Amino acid sequence: FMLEVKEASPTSIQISWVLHLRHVRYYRITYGETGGNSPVQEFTVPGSKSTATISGLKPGVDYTITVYAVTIFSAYRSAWPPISINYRTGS
Amino acid sequence: YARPIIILGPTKDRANDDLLSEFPDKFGSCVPHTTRPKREYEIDGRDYHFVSSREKMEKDIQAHKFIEAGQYNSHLYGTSVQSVREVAEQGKHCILDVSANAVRRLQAAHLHPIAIFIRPRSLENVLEINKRITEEQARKAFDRATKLEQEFTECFSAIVEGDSFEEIYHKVKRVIEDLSG
Question: Where, per UniProt, does this protein localize (chain B)?
């Protein structure tokens, strides 16, 4: 469905997604300052995971977070489309 | 011997996924190669074949041992001819998520692939068969499918259409059975 976010701290969030593909090698998480020349940061979680922790965020700053499913049928390229949201911590 | 499968076009990821879940004795997936170091949760021989010598994978690539390979994040990744052949020789259709360019490479390896293109009838049709995307995304998928058909029609074993994903999937299943003799 959608990408869910919960703020764990002004520097850290917990993002969650709905397992739609059954045969996923891993999910790829990328996050970066919403509108920013700075390259994106990224990591992975096993295809069994539907949640991930992102910390080290600048508080109050808008970040673009996207999650890519990499299926077992693929060597690296992800399934399309990825799911994404824009989020800033603090409220 | 089971012919490996490449499904391309809108909803191909859902088709790949449901084929394996619904007929796990007739379909399988192969284990790709990478030169990136293994992650703690990964298992050699299951997630990837973790190649120690980048130079070794490079020779294999130049020797045409991979039906598809590239560099991503300074590491090499490929789907190998042998890995596909190993699945097919178990009598399982190897479900592949690869570029259309790989179809030729499979034919050169005498692997006799089945390639099926899902053709959207229109932009509206994209939204009929994929009810999980925006109209903005549907037009991207429509544009890409158009360009896919224009470049790779000769590689397709079949082109299938439908007013719903159920109709697409029914045709995909029937085509694979027919081509499986």
Answer: Cell membrane; Postsynaptic density; Synapse; Cytoplasm
Query: A71 CB near a chain B CB, below 8 Å?
Result: yes
Please tell me which residue of chain A has the smallest CA distance to B36: A76
Domain boundaries, chain B: 1-180
List the determination method.
X-ray
Resolution of the model in angstroms? 1.9
Contact at CB, A79 and B39, closer than 8 angstroms: no
Task: Tell me the C-alpha distance between B178 and A66, whole Å.
Answer: 40
- Tell me yes or no: is domain A4-87 CATH 3.40.718.10: no
In angstroms, rounded to a whole number, what is the distance separating the alpha carbons of residues B33 and B57?
Answer: 8
Q: Is A38 on the interface with B (CB under 8 A)?
A: no
Residue B147, classified by CB atoms within 10 Å of its CB into exposed (0-12), middle (13-18) or buried (19+), is exposed
> Is residue A25 less than 8 Å (CB to CB) from chain B?
yes
Phi then psi dihedrals of residue B12, to 5 deg? -65, -35
Q: Which CATH superfamily is domain B1-180 in?
A: P-loop containing nucleotide triphosphate hydrolases (3.40.50.300)
CA-based nearest residue in chain A for residue B4: A73
Number of Cβ within a 10 Å radius of residue B151? 10
The domain locations on chain A are 4-87
